[PDB]
Structure 1
Amino acid sequence: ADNKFNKEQQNAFYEILHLPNLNEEQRNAFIQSLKDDPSQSANLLAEAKKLNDAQAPK
């Protein structure tokens, strides 16, 4: 009765939530954007995943 999102879309949500290095503010931005338009699932995911990989020093 909740989450009118496809598997990929909901996966994007969770995967962006699974970004511990990503600023929670940016996380909220991507998540909210996913809520606004989940059509950008694969690619808000591609590039939250990729600020998460790219604020990552080594």
Structure 2
Amino acid sequence: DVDNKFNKEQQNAFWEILHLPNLNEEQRNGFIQSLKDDPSQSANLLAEAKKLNDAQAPK
């Protein structure tokens, strides 16, 4: 399910997903599902989100 307790650093990652202006809301969900599989690896996930933004290249 969902862990009532969270790490403050983890919260930072959640906001970055929201920031991605280039990406629509559905893409953001994809990161969340990954987070559930490996909460310890959320840091690893943090690096991946920035990379995806480049690919959309709305400009």
Q: Shorter-normalised TM-score: what interval?
A: 0.5 to 0.7
Identify unmatched segments of 5+ residues in structure 2: none
1:13 aligned partner: 14
Distance 1:51 1:30, change over 3 A: same
TM-score by length of 2: 0.65
Per the TM alignment, residue 48 of structure 1 is displaced from its structure 2 partner at its CA by: 1.5
Distance 1:6 1:27, change over 3 A: same
* CA distance in 2: counterparts of 1:42 and 1:35, whole angstroms: 13
Q: Which has the higher helix share?
A: 2
Per the TM alignment, residue 36 of structure 1 is displaced from its structure 2 partner at its CA by: 4.8
Alignment length (residue pairs) = 58
Per the TM alignment, residue 28 of structure 1 is displaced from its structure 2 partner at its CA by: 0.7
2:22 touches 2:58 (CA, 8 Å); kept in 1?
no
SS of corresponding position for 2:56: coil
TM-score by length of 1: 0.66
Identify unmatched segments of 5+ residues in structure 1: none
- After superposition, the C-alpha distances for 1:2-58 in whole angstroms (9 at most, x for unaligned) are 963212211101111111112322211112332454322221221122101232265
4+ residue stretches of structure 1 with deviation over 3 A?
none
